[PDB]
Write a protein that binds this ligand. Structure first.
Ligand SMILES: CC(C)(COP(=O)(O)OP(=O)(O)OC[C@H]1O[C@@H](n2cnc3c(N)ncnc32)[C@H](O)[C@@H]1OP(=O)(O)O)[C@@H](O)C(=O)NCCC(=O)NCCS
Length: 142
């Protein structure tokens, strides 16, 4: 009688490790609108010690942080690309994540793209899917 478990196949321990260790985040789809999920999670991660670089070519500053047009333009190392964009947009961002040397691609709810997931797996990145960083942080480090 196997229980349902997340499809990315990571244990609670693996996620807790990624949430404790990898705190340089490129948050793609960042938005200054309070209503968007990306704004709520970006504020929460900044309140919990994450260094969050918003990425969205539309904006130059979001929540007081300079906003970049690509993960590759961020002047720092990036460990996690946290995706708040539609599925077909994620392939490009996974490609940027690979070229930047990120360690983890994190597909937030309704962003998963199989093809993008495949390029990330081929390059060796850890893939987290169908979870929220905020909710996993609350569940595991709360
Ligand atoms: C993926 C998602 C944003 C789609 O929602 P949607 O209502 O269709 O919104 P859109 O994709 O049109 O736009 C959202 C943002 O993407 C940004 N965006 C669009 N194209 C982009 C691109 N190429 N690069 C970066 N950002 C982009 C837009 O600027 C927009 O922000 P804005 O309204 O400030 O302009 C949405 O399903 C989502 O928020 N998923 C994550 C949900 C989640 O995990 N919530 C946490 C719950 S605890």
């Amino acid at each position: 009688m196997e229980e349902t478990r997340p499809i990315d196949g990571l244990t609670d321990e693996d996620i807790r490790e990624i949430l404790t260790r990898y705190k340089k985040i490129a948050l793609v789809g960042a938005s200054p609108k309070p209503e968007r999920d990306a704004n709520i999670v970006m504020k929460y991660l900044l309140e919990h010690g994450y260094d969050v670089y918003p990425v969205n070519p539309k904006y130059e500053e979001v929540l007081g942080r300079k906003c970049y047009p690509s993960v590759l333009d961020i002047p720092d190392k990036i460990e996690v690309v946290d995706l708040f964009v539609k599925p077909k947009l994620t392939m490009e961002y996974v490609e940027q994540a690979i070229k930047k040397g990120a360690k983890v691609v994190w597909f937030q709810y309704n962003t998963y793209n199989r093809e993008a997931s495949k390029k990330a797996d081929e390059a060796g990145l850890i893939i987290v899917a169908n979870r929220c960083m905020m909710r996993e942080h609350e569940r595991l480090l709360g």
